[PDB]
Amino acid sequence: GIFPVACSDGYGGLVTTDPKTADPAYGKVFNPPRNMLPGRFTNFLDVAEACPTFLHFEGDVPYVTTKTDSDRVLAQFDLSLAAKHMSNTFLAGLAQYYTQYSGTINLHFMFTGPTDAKARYMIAYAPPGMEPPKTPEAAAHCIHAEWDTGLNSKFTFSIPYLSAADYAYTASDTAETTNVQGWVCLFQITHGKADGDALVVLASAGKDFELRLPVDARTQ
Amino acid sequence: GIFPVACSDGYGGLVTTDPKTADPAYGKVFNPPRNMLPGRFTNFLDVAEACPTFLHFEGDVPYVTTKTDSDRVLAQFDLSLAAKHMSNTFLAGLAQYYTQYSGTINLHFMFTGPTDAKARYMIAYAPPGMEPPKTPEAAAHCIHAEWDTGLNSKFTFSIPYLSAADYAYTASDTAETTNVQGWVCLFQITHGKADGDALVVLASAGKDFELRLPVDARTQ
Amino acid sequence: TTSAGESADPVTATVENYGGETQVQRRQHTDVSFILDRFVKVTPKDQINVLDLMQTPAHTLVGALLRTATYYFADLEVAVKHEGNLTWVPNGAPEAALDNTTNPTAYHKAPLTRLALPYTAPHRVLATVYNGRALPTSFNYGAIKATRVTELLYRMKRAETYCPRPLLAIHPDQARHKQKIVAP
Amino acid sequence: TTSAGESADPVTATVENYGGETQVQRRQHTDVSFILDRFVKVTPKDQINVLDLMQTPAHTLVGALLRTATYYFADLEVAVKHEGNLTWVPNGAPEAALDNTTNPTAYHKAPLTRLALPYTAPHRVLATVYNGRALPTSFNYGAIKATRVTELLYRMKRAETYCPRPLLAIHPDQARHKQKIVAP
Amino acid sequence: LLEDRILTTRNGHTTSTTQSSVGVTYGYATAEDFVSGPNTSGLETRVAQAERFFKTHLFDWVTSDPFGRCHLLELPTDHKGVYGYLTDSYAYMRNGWDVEVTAVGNQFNGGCLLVAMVPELCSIQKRELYQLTLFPHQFINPRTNMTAHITVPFVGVNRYDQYKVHKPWTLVVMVVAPLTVNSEGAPQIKVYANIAPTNVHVAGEFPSKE
Amino acid sequence: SGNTGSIINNYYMQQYQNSMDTQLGNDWFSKLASSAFSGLFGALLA
Amino acid sequence: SGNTGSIINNYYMQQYQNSMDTQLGNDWFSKLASSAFSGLFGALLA
């Protein structure tokens, strides 16, 4: 006769990811040419990593002006993708679609002021367990670094991947106000006729960076 | 045309054990690392055998105190998993899930009393066909052994696998009050200022031990 | 990692710098071809529906990622929970062209329609934005019609865009946007 | 087989000792990976159900054995006799994340749902007891939702715990617990 | 008066000795999970300086003291020295409690405590108390030993565990056999506990009290 | 891994059924089981 | 191309599933990504 078969229940009922492919019913189509076409790419952490973006900010502007008082802290916020300044950036304008991640992200700095405007800044990075400082003095006890304007302007600091689990989420809750990943915080040493200048910070994916588990869920 | 097929009735209707596997619809997932992770294991008769447990008892305590009269019998009961003292132990806290078994189980002894407390015990093992003794004298006629406290404390006696069928059940009925596997019974010779001491008995799986035929059925 | 900035030559930085090591990331998931192959259920507006893409919700995964790379190419795998017989018709083919059973006129079963779809544009490439709400009439992957279509999904295939675009999301308010995840 | 006991070095004993021989046991069944691969039907509490495990009856085979080894890893094979379309969503993903058809939104047939499920925790390992009724929000194997779910079963897969726990059962009363077996 | 057995265990500068030795036992592990993980991105270092002994008190094993008293002692726990300051200046780390438990009476009493070192938990069922015989554990009896000792590995749920709010390791000693002063035996046994945190490395760091 | 007696490659690719266990760089309970002596601390007679 | 883990030639011939890409005669974004220095414009100390 013929090969028997078990019409197995539950195997084959349409899946929005189903591994197999459907049936073709036209075939024999020779398309145009796609030769060396400009600026292609095939990975979003390739352009993320490859072309940073500035950060939204208080007000909205990307830059930041030199405080001329004891209040030095030029920045400070939740070290996670929820980060408002990031929430719009290229790397953040996508981590939405991936439940978790790991890796490193970068913070590039720039000056724009006169040459008669020599200035100094700081970059502290504290973790979960305590609230961020407000005094580079107290902060100089985290994993940091100091720099001062010069000939070359830019500078990109990579911030460390630290967490119990090798991962953790991109989303957040009013349970995580203690954040599972830290409160990175940038400050301001001293300066000269360098008050009110522009120190714009951008963001790219460091090499350590990685992103996984696709999640789509209403985002505009 | 195409390969005919016999949509065979009765083959494929969901089975809580079905040999085959289901369909995957996400795939390409690289997990974290599970390298040399502490105290693993993959067999429950491995930890059963590998790490014994004491026995519940009259009252509840595990140990037992030296009778100071003719009543010597320190223990005695149904040689089966239903055994209350065992029913909680590790080996018994699982044989629930397996209809039958075969093999050997062990009874480890220990003293706890003073050095001015030299004592002697006994271990008889009678089978189905008669009721257990109450006199090591009458008992010395089963397959037994004698021992006395010393330098080394512990001691583990393996009790024999005897039954018509190479198997028999872990469960029991008010039909089996004659038990298909015997009434093991421990006694007490003589002693010295060694009355009221603690002779705690534990239980592991001997090497001969085996367990089969998975049965799940309401147990708390 | 200092450098010149008004030069915008890619000048990254990484761990090692001040300390720490750097790891071996497995970005398999952020693979453009991988995360665009998974159906998008757009509203099959009546019966005569054009296999466009800017019809899809510009907020869904395959939608968004779609709206982020100017150029692109790919094929199609559709779905049509519906009524009657889906009679698709190629690109350029007269609206009216879609009706004759001789055309690929699929015959209903239970319950939708899973079929493959070539990319049939006369142009060597297509785009979500033509500078030439106002985008070209050759920008359609064929066109379907049955006699009542309830589910329209487009599994894009063998994906591959070119050039980039801006990626932003859910404007928070507390520097950290809060939204219930999956809890025990 | 005497020995020192306050040393707790494993010191077993066996037949031969006083006599008899010892046999060749075939414990294939008490194989941890083997007797954990066989579905457990836990109450699919409404529609939005989290793929947890301490939801299961801590008295069933796959449940009990589950609650006996602190650590563990494994994958998943579910079942969903139900209504509508099961749209599962990964771990960490926003509760709300489970709704968009683009997500793995399975399409009903007859009668339940048999699909495979990766273990997707950010932690290299999970547990039924975190000393950190009170256990972690990353301890979930994704999360399902349809529009009415009647049967929830979890065939754990490629099982493998670590470390042990206490195994006890049906406290008898007559030193021998009586309960009708299978008779002729 | 026997096969004879002694032993001293050095940890840093601290070194517990004993004569009623009996031995020891390591359970679950004997090693440690590659503490050069991803989450610590090279940003982790060895601080085997605070690796040593500190004293804390267990209960007092008294004649009455029922068949269950198992004075718990979480590990980690309050540290007035090194390891403690370390946990206050750090978020992520991992170690391995040595633990060398004593309980002094003399070679004349009866009864036994049950020493065990178990991980993640919350609380235990009495009916379960009959199976400590499953996790790193020792057995005490004055007619052979005065000391216990059992050296625990690292389990954690992760590679680099945080302790500000979590304590994977707990230490219990349920009285398996009640105590008997007896004719000439000692009067009471205060169970003392000697611990030490080993193979530990840190990663992470906060500002300062200021 | 329990009950997988399929004669085929369960069709769907390797990197698809289960999630691949990335490495780094009874395991132990069998280690402390397969080492229990049945000897005698004295010397057998008869 | 996304999620194609079929072990067969997906049955239906090559010139049938998708439409064949006639030639003529990350491509580039990977080209400007894999070239970002983590060096120092001065000289490391300590």
PDB file of N, CA, C and O in Angstrom, chain C residues 2-25:
ATOM      1  N   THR C   2      41.338  59.585  24.262  1.00  0.00           N
ATOM      2  CA  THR C   2      41.193  60.908  23.656  1.00  0.00           C
ATOM      3  C   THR C   2      41.312  60.765  22.152  1.00  0.00           C
ATOM      4  O   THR C   2      41.425  59.652  21.643  1.00  0.00           O
ATOM      5  N   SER C   3      41.297  61.894  21.452  1.00  0.00           N
ATOM      6  CA  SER C   3      41.408  61.918  19.997  1.00  0.00           C
ATOM      7  C   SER C   3      40.901  63.256  19.495  1.00  0.00           C
ATOM      8  O   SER C   3      40.526  64.119  20.292  1.00  0.00           O
ATOM      9  N   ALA C   4      40.904  63.427  18.173  1.00  0.00           N
ATOM     10  CA  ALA C   4      40.375  64.641  17.555  1.00  0.00           C
ATOM     11  C   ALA C   4      38.859  64.357  17.327  1.00  0.00           C
ATOM     12  O   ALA C   4      38.489  63.281  16.847  1.00  0.00           O
ATOM     13  N   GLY C   5      37.980  65.293  17.691  1.00  0.00           N
ATOM     14  CA  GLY C   5      36.554  65.048  17.521  1.00  0.00           C
ATOM     15  C   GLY C   5      35.833  65.718  16.358  1.00  0.00           C
ATOM     16  O   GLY C   5      34.806  65.240  15.888  1.00  0.00           O
ATOM     17  N   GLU C   6      36.345  66.842  15.888  1.00  0.00           N
ATOM     18  CA  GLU C   6      35.703  67.521  14.779  1.00  0.00           C
ATOM     19  C   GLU C   6      36.069  66.803  13.478  1.00  0.00           C
ATOM     20  O   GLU C   6      35.881  67.347  12.388  1.00  0.00           O
ATOM     21  N   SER C   7      36.583  65.575  13.610  1.00  0.00           N
ATOM     22  CA  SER C   7      37.007  64.729  12.473  1.00  0.00           C
ATOM     23  C   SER C   7      36.041  63.545  12.293  1.00  0.00           C
ATOM     24  O   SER C   7      35.976  62.911  11.233  1.00  0.00           O
ATOM     25  N   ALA C   8      35.294  63.261  13.346  1.00  0.00           N
ATOM     26  CA  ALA C   8      34.328  62.189  13.331  1.00  0.00           C
ATOM     27  C   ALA C   8      34.803  60.885  12.681  1.00  0.00           C
ATOM     28  O   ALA C   8      33.997  60.157  12.105  1.00  0.00           O
ATOM     29  N   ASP C   9      36.102  60.584  12.744  1.00  0.00           N
ATOM     30  CA  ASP C   9      36.576  59.292  12.203  1.00  0.00           C
ATOM     31  C   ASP C   9      36.126  58.369  13.348  1.00  0.00           C
ATOM     32  O   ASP C   9      36.247  58.754  14.518  1.00  0.00           O
ATOM     33  N   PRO C  10      35.581  57.171  13.055  1.00  0.00           N
ATOM     34  CA  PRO C  10      35.209  56.399  14.252  1.00  0.00           C
ATOM     35  C   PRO C  10      36.403  56.223  15.192  1.00  0.00           C
ATOM     36  O   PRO C  10      37.452  55.719  14.787  1.00  0.00           O
ATOM     37  N   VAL C  11      36.222  56.688  16.432  1.00  0.00           N
ATOM     38  CA  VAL C  11      37.231  56.658  17.507  1.00  0.00           C
ATOM     39  C   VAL C  11      36.615  56.102  18.810  1.00  0.00           C
ATOM     40  O   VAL C  11      36.439  56.842  19.774  1.00  0.00           O
ATOM     41  N   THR C  12      36.291  54.810  18.844  1.00  0.00           N
ATOM     42  CA  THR C  12      35.681  54.201  20.042  1.00  0.00           C
ATOM     43  C   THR C  12      36.680  54.145  21.206  1.00  0.00           C
ATOM     44  O   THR C  12      37.710  54.838  21.207  1.00  0.00           O
ATOM     45  N   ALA C  13      36.337  53.315  22.192  1.00  0.00           N
ATOM     46  CA  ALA C  13      37.133  53.064  23.389  1.00  0.00           C
ATOM     47  C   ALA C  13      36.543  51.799  23.992  1.00  0.00           C
ATOM     48  O   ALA C  13      35.432  51.396  23.632  1.00  0.00           O
ATOM     49  N   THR C  14      37.279  51.172  24.901  1.00  0.00           N
ATOM     50  CA  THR C  14      36.798  49.953  25.536  1.00  0.00           C
ATOM     51  C   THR C  14      37.421  49.685  26.885  1.00  0.00           C
ATOM     52  O   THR C  14      38.441  50.267  27.258  1.00  0.00           O
ATOM     53  N   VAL C  15      36.782  48.772  27.601  1.00  0.00           N
ATOM     54  CA  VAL C  15      37.202  48.354  28.922  1.00  0.00           C
ATOM     55  C   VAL C  15      38.700  48.594  29.196  1.00  0.00           C
ATOM     56  O   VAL C  15      39.083  49.686  29.613  1.00  0.00           O
ATOM     57  N   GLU C  16      39.532  47.585  28.941  1.00  0.00           N
ATOM     58  CA  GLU C  16      40.972  47.650  29.187  1.00  0.00           C
ATOM     59  C   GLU C  16      41.506  48.987  29.644  1.00  0.00           C
ATOM     60  O   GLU C  16      42.167  49.073  30.674  1.00  0.00           O
ATOM     61  N   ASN C  17      41.218  50.027  28.873  1.00  0.00           N
ATOM     62  CA  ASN C  17      41.695  51.377  29.161  1.00  0.00           C
ATOM     63  C   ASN C  17      42.168  51.659  30.598  1.00  0.00           C
ATOM     64  O   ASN C  17      43.376  51.826  30.857  1.00  0.00           O
ATOM     65  N   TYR C  18      41.211  51.715  31.518  1.00  0.00           N
ATOM     66  CA  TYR C  18      41.485  52.014  32.915  1.00  0.00           C
ATOM     67  C   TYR C  18      41.580  50.747  33.733  1.00  0.00           C
ATOM     68  O   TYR C  18      41.973  50.779  34.900  1.00  0.00           O
ATOM     69  N   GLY C  19      41.217  49.633  33.104  1.00  0.00           N
ATOM     70  CA  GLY C  19      41.245  48.337  33.766  1.00  0.00           C
ATOM     71  C   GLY C  19      40.323  47.335  33.082  1.00  0.00           C
ATOM     72  O   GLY C  19      39.990  47.505  31.907  1.00  0.00           O
ATOM     73  N   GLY C  20      39.919  46.291  33.805  1.00  0.00           N
ATOM     74  CA  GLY C  20      39.026  45.273  33.259  1.00  0.00           C
ATOM     75  C   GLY C  20      39.342  44.636  31.907  1.00  0.00           C
ATOM     76  O   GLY C  20      40.181  45.112  31.138  1.00  0.00           O
ATOM     77  N   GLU C  21      38.647  43.546  31.610  1.00  0.00           N
ATOM     78  CA  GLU C  21      38.848  42.851  30.352  1.00  0.00           C
ATOM     79  C   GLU C  21      37.640  43.066  29.484  1.00  0.00           C
ATOM     80  O   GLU C  21      36.652  43.655  29.902  1.00  0.00           O
ATOM     81  N   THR C  22      37.719  42.585  28.260  1.00  0.00           N
ATOM     82  CA  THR C  22      36.605  42.735  27.350  1.00  0.00           C
ATOM     83  C   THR C  22      36.133  41.358  26.901  1.00  0.00           C
ATOM     84  O   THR C  22      36.932  40.447  26.658  1.00  0.00           O
ATOM     85  N   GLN C  23      34.824  41.221  26.765  1.00  0.00           N
ATOM     86  CA  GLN C  23      34.256  39.936  26.430  1.00  0.00           C
ATOM     87  C   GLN C  23      33.934  39.582  24.955  1.00  0.00           C
ATOM     88  O   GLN C  23      34.124  40.403  24.042  1.00  0.00           O
ATOM     89  N   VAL C  24      33.475  38.329  24.761  1.00  0.00           N
ATOM     90  CA  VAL C  24      33.096  37.725  23.461  1.00  0.00           C
ATOM     91  C   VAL C  24      31.587  37.742  23.278  1.00  0.00           C
ATOM     92  O   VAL C  24      30.914  36.752  23.575  1.00  0.00           O
ATOM     93  N   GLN C  25      31.066  38.850  22.766  1.00  0.00           N
ATOM     94  CA  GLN C  25      29.633  38.994  22.578  1.00  0.00           C
ATOM     95  C   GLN C  25      29.084  38.176  21.418  1.00  0.00           C
ATOM     96  O   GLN C  25      29.742  38.020  20.391  1.00  0.00           O
TER      97      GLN C  25
END
